[PDB]
Amino acid sequence: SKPFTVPILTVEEMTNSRFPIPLEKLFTGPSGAFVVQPQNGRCTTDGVLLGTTQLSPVNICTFRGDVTHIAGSRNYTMNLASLNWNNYDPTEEIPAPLGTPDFVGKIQGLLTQTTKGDGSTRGHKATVYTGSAPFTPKLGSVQFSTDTDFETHQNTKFTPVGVIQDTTHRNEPQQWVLPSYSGRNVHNVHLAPAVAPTFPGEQLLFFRSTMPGCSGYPNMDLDCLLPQEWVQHFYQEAAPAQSDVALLRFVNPDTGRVLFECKLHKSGYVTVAHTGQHDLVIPPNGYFRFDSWVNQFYTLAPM
Amino acid sequence: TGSKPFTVPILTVEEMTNSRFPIPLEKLFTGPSGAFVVQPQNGRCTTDGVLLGTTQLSPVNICTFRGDVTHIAGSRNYTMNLASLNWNNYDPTEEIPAPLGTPDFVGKIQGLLTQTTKGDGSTRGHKATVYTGSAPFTPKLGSVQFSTDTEXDFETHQNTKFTPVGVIQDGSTTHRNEPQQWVLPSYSGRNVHNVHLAPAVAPTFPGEQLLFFRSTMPGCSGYPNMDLDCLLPQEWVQHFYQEAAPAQSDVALLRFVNPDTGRVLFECKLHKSGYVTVAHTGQHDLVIPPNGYFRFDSWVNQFYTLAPM
Ligand SMILES: CO[C@@H]1O[C@@H](C)[C@@H](O)[C@@H](O)[C@@H]1O
Ligand SMILES: CO[C@@H]1O[C@@H](C)[C@@H](O)[C@@H](O)[C@@H]1O
Ligand SMILES: [Mg+2]
Ligand SMILES: [Mg+2]
């Protein structure tokens, strides 16, 4: 069987799988009390994509389609196309279009458009409210608010940049609250499962970034379960799993020594032996290395 | 056994990222260089994993800037004192052309400037443009200038980020006159030469042309030329950097394959210094299936004649 491996890039060389920004650090904390169920950055170790996960680091939280103006405001409805401008199929057995935001919050960026006939172009600051009633990406449409021009039947793109807040500080975004992908009073479908440590003394290990803030006092923490480069790697390699748990070691090349070890579960998430909230202190050139497949009762050395 | 076998990723063109701007690839393109010299500085990496020019590993940090800013109380423009991509101090004596990820073409790049005040976590963001052909574009010296749409609110001594979105055109009656993707900026200003560049590339074998990985940059105003060609997908850069497989000649023979059927559509040469050539004549958007991908066959000699494509 093809040997399993993980990418050897450092944390700072890899990308968050839930927003198009670099990873910055590793974090662990208790989460047994709440539900961890992100839909981007979900992939098994043998390469099966889950949830709304797709392969491009720059298409996360983007939208493409045509727009129509909502009379008496600066708001536009976008009729969604696929990530490569084909028709969007709402019957596919996924929660929402691939790359759809998987948290409730106000995402700010630029809405841009090109007119086919003459190549004229235009761009305006815009915000999408993923908690709002018109946020119905599974049905094929979302709404943007703008600050200011957009034509009908012309290709239009939202490029995300960051998040806003607008009361009590850091109350939004809520990175662990899923949007309602079909809107009010419709339950979500085909979700990737919630994850949690199943072994005593363990916690999830998160790959953490800080989202840019564009207004107010947002909570800018964003944790993903797998780097986007790991998703890309497992998808291509499709190496068979020889157990439910891949043991990884995090290595400091300056000394050759292992800093900590962790479990990469076959269904696509990492746990460590730690109790409490902890920002890991790592060497910037450290990397992860697969060492062996282990059984269900393997006890990690304390992180 | 022997040398580690060389490979390229199996991702399709449409699943990969442009190495010169943070957008997906769309198609393949070939043409003669014409009046321009092809010397891009992002997306430059040897097949055994040596990064060149301003190339770095993150697909989303391409054409970004980070640092602190200063206004003038008589203009909407801000000067940014540059830091490196992980907020480390940027040293102008480092042997690189400019901070890694700096734009490598002359044009007007629009995006958002954003900032967080460390003390209380207050944040702000405004549309901003950087003209990489302008005299204040001096990233090798550690500063660039941005024009913003509103008179002021950005604070001094606070971390500030530019996220690129697309390109604009203005100040011309001729459409699509800018950006000029093969004209390098003057990273220290026009009366100083650029340094430590990744070299220019060109087909060296009779009847061959460069093969490019092409995207269309978003346009944000005016009538810009939105074509953007790179020599290697960003995912190929990441792959070679990790694998560091030795090159066993100057040229790797690759085949481009349709996955739906497995059949070979054309063959090409991946030169060990990090660019691709094909046997073709003319300036053309290639007709390929969207899901096509490349596979390494063998290291070939310098006098190998490719089958025409
Ligand atoms: C509401 O205004 C926006 O948010 C505030 C908290 C400030 O950070 C201000 O500079 C910014 O423009
Ligand atoms: C100058 O104005 C900008 O460029 C023009 C060519 C138009 O596309 C217009 O919609 C856009 O706002
Ligand atoms: Mg340990
Ligand atoms: Mg051929």
Residue numbers in the entry:
A (entry chain B): 224 to 371, 374 to 391, 394 to 530
B (entry chain A): 222 to 530
The authors write:
Binding of human norovirus to histo blood group antigens (HBGAs), a critical step preceding host-cell entry, has been the focus of a substantial number of biophysical studies involving nuclear magnetic resonance (NMR) experiments, native mass spectrometry (MS), surface plasmon resonance, or crystallography as this has been reviewed recently. The highly conserved HBGA-binding sites are located in the P2 subdomain of the P-domain of the norovirus capsid protein VP116–18. Here, we present an almost complete backbone assignment of the P-dimers and uncover spontaneous deamidation of asparagine 373, influencing HBGA binding. In the assignment process we discovered that N373, located in a loop directly adjoining the HBGA-binding site, transforms into an iso-aspartate, isoD373, within 1–2 days at body temperature.
The deamidated form of Saga P-dimers was then subjected to crystal structure analysis in the presence of methyl α-l-fucopyranoside. Well-diffracting apo crystals were obtained belonging to the space group P21, different from C21 as observed previously for the native form of Saga P-dimers. Upon incubation of deamidated P-dimer apo crystals with 600 mM methyl α-l-fucopyranoside we obtained a co-crystal structure at 1.52 Å resolution, in which the isoD373 isopeptide bond is clearly visible in one of the two protein chains that comprise the asymmetric unit (i.e. in one half of the P-dimer). We also observed binding of methyl α-l-fucopyranoside to the two canonical HBGA-binding sites in the Saga P-dimer. In the chain with unambiguous density for the isopeptide bond the side chain of D374 is rotated such that one oxygen of the γ-carboxy group forms a single hydrogen bond to OH-4 of methyl α-l-fucopyranoside (left). In this chain, no unambiguous density is observed for residue 373 and the preceding amino acids, and so the density does not allow us to determine whether this chain contains an N373 or an isoD373 residue. In our crystal structure of the deamidated P-dimer complexed with methyl α-l-fucopyranoside two binding geometries can be observed at the same time, i.e. one in each crystallographically distinct half of the P-dimer. Fucose binds to the modified binding pocket in much the same place and orientation as observed for the native protein, but the hydrogen bonding to the side chain carboxy group of D374 appears altered as shown in Fig. 7 and Supplementary Fig. 23. The altered D374 side-chain orientation and the loss of one hydrogen bond can be explained by altered conformational dynamics of the loop. Except for the loop carrying the isopeptide bond, the overall structure of the P-dimers is very similar to the structures published before.
